[PDB]
Write a protein that binds this ligand. Structure first.
Ligand SMILES: [Zn+2]
Length: 636
RNA sequence: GGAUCGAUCGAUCGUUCGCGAUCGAUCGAUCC
């Protein structure tokens, strides 16, 4: 049974104009979209049929929307199906669209089809319902659909142009500082969705006040540790590793020019990966000791990165998890690495391991952040013993660390590990949500509850304060835009989307000139010859592979831990560099149609030209420019 | 494998305020 709040939300898009309907609850969002769909299909006279498309960006929400739509739009003689990645293989999407009314297709499918050629005009549909439409920022699938829509609208060939009603919960803030910029951002979002009304509950505010789901803020600024003996030991090990790495690279400080570096920080990680990317371009003409020196610096730099991550984990999470993480890394890479460089580094680590284990088991070196975390958890749990809480950490190296700390803490017994009969649900990003804890993690909260923010920096505190200020500013700007009439808003959005179309069509890249030289690829940590670009074939303008049989013996197969097909191939195993001690992540082994193909990634490669002898480095395939010969199945 | 979004950090230019802007790196999440 619809209520007055539903009808007040659904009022402006009822008349036949595009809206930015924003309801916070998910059930309310589903209900307003359902009512809009029902009255859009009911208002059509005989002989004409609607083709409403509902866009869902997530697979579980696609399942949920398809379920509710097929449960409600079932007795009315309406045909409803849906498309996804595991459904759209060799299936005539044109036949579905021409013979369905309430397709609940995901947006990437429509982008792929519009780029392919199928479904040429966007006027086939009549009602586009975007779920969580605030994601339309730049180059998104929603924004690609809107690009094609605006291309169709502003090209002078406007036909039965479908409604593009957007549905959300928060209209979004962007990076606003003052109300003019927030108003400009809201107008830009509205014009990108091409709507002139923003539906928002105003006359039935107590309907939302009945169920609002808003928490209170409970900032707890904490102090870091002071007796950082372990940080001293790991810093000494860092200094030793870097000094012995400097024996083979005299100018190691000069490859990266940023600033002075300090251990246990993200800046050190950036310096580590920059100097990692720096030394894989060496041009020593021996080509045999070049492999060993490149392997040596890769091993040293990967070790330094691992110690830096261990330092970060020890700074944030508890001690023993950081030590066990380092021991696990040394166990997994020791089981693969058997050279004397690994022998030296590993023997240095076990030489320090006795001191590390002695300093790890000291209760006097407990982190105060976890101390007052369990202290606030204990007071609130003694206040309420049926409360399920959710804790957010920034990194996946900490979600298991906090779970281990929960399991190994004897001061608490009511908690259960909830890695995402489950008391506390430890997760990293995203039910009842009766308690939310943000441990050193800055992000979104709007997605008798409480929100305890724990941090060792006041930057997060001032960031959240200006986040509340920008939320208030966005609400005021929304009310100001709702004050306006239909005309001036319409030519304002028309001018700004004309400007957006101008810059979008102006910012077009030409075709890169393909080189006429046969440049080749080499492994990252090994610098051995992998394959020339003349034997590289591109499948669907995104994936690349090698068709030579000499390449087939250059790698080895390792079974994939998480294999899953994506609409074109199916994944069987990863390919690794088959050398003495390389074991580097080259790519992945799939089947496209019948053949087995090892599709590779240029991220873990270094490309050199046979003529000039320079080893340049690329990170993604689009930046790499060469004669992309298409893959022909007639060869092999 | 490929593309996309979000958060942190760093480099470069323009104005000595608050900063604005192209590029880059790490971590997390989604879809194909
Ligand atoms: Zn290799």
């Amino acid at each position: 049974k619809p209520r007055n709040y539903q009808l007040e939300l659904a009022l402006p898009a009822m008349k036949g104009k595009n809206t930015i309907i924003c309801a916070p609850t998910g059930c309310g969002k589903t209900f307003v979209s359902l009512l809009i769909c029902e009255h859009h299909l009911k208002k059509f006279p005989q002989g004409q049929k609607g083709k409403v498309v509902f866009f869902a960006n997530q697979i579980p929400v696609y399942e949920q929307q398809k379920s509710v739509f097929s449960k409600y739009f079932e007795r009315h003689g309406y045909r409803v199906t849906g498309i996804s990645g595991a459904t759209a293989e060799n299936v005539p999407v044109e036949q579905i669209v021409e013979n369905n009314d309430i397709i609940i297709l995901t947006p990437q499918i429509l982008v792929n089809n519009l780029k392919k050629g199928t479904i040429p005009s966007l006027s086939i549909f009549t009602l586009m319902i975007f779920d969580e439409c605030h994601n339309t920022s730049k180059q998104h699938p929603y924004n690609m659909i809107m690009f094609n829509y605006l291309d169709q609208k502003l090209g002078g060939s406007s036909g039965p142009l479908p409604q593009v009603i957007g549905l959300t919960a928060s209209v979004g803030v962007g990076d606003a500082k003052n109300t003019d910029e927030a108003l400009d951002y809201i107008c830009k979002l509205c014009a990108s969705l091409d709507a002139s009304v923003i539906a928002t509950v105003k006359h039935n505010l107590e309907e939302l006040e009945q169920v609002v789901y808003k928490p209170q803020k409970f900032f707890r600024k904490v102090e870091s540790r002071i007796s950082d003996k372990f940080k001293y030991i790991i810093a000494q090990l860092m200094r030793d590793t870097e000094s012995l790495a400097k024996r083979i690279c005299k100018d190691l400080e000069n490859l990266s020019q940023i600033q002075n570096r300090e251990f246990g920080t993200q800046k050190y990680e950036q310096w580590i990966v920059t100097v990692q990317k720096a030394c894989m371009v060496f041009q020593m003409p021996d080509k045999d000791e070049e492999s060993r020196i490149c392997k040596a610096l890769f091993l040293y730099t990967s070790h330094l990165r691992k110690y830096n991550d261990a330092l970060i984990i020890s700074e944030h999470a508890r001690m023993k998890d950081a030590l066990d993480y380092l021991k696990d890394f040394f166990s997994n890479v020791r089981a693969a690495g058997f050279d004397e460089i690994e022998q030296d580094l590993t023997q240095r680590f076990e030489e320090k391991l006795q001191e590390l284990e002695s300093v790890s088991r000291d209760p006097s070196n407990e982190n105060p952040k976890l101390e007052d975390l369990c202290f606030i958890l204990q007071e609130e749990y003694h206040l309420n013993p049926e409360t399920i809480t959710i804790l957010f950490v920034k990194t996946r190296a900490l979600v298991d660390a906090l779970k281990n700390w929960i399991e190994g803490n004897p001061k608490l017994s009511f908690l259960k590990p909830g890695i995402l009969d489950h008391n506390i649900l430890i997760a990293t990003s995203v039910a009842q949500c009766n308690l939310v804890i943000l441990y050193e993690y800055v992000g979104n909260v709007i997605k008798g509850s409480k929100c305890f923010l724990l941090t060792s920096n006041a930057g997060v505190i001032e960031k959240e304060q200006i986040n509340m200020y920008k939320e208030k500013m966005m609400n005021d700007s929304i009310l100001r835009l709702q004050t306006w009439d239909e005309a001036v808003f319409r030519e304002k959005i028309l001018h700004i989307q004309t400007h957006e179309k101008f810059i979008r069509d102006s910012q077009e890249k030409p075709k890169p000139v393909p080189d006429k030289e046969n440049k080749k690829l080499l492994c990252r940590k090994c610098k051995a010859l992998a394959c020339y670009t003349a034997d590289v074939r591109v499948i669907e303008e995104c994936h690349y592979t090698v068709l030579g049989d000499a390449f087939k013996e250059c790698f080895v197969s390792r079974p994939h831990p998480k294999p899953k097909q994506f609409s074109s191939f199916e994944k069987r195993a990863k390919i690794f560099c088959a050398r003495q001690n390389c074991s580097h992540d080259w790519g992945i082994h799939v089947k496209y149609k019948t053949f087995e193909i090892p599709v590779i990634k240029i991220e873990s490669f270094v490309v050199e030209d046979i003529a000039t002898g320079v080893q340049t480095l690329y990170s993604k395939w689009k930046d790499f420019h060469f004669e992309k010969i298409p893959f022909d199945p007639a060869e092999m």
